[PDB]
């Protein structure tokens, strides 16, 4: 959390067997909108890929 490693947060709670559906959906948004954020320098076909 202090570094916001969402791709590690999801692995921790999978390994720990703990599943709040709200946290899990929040982590998939944190992952999707970071991959959408940091890919902004690139064309739509490239960002789809």
């Amino acid at each position: 959390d202090p570094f916001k490693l969402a791709e590690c947060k999801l692995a921790i709670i999978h390994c720990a067997g703990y599943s709040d559906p709200i946290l899990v959906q929040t982590l998939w948004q944190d992952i999707i909108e970071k991959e959408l954020s940091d890919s902004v320098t690139l064309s739509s076909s490239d960002r789809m890929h």
Binding site: P2, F3, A16
Partner: peptide, 19 residues
């Protein structure tokens, strides 16, 4: 340990020097 505990109420700030 395998048992997770959330405690957002007290964290060190990642994004800072130490005092």
């Amino acid at each position: 340990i395998k048992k997770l505990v959330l405690k957002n109420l007290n964290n060190s700030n990642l994004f800072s020097p130490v005092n």
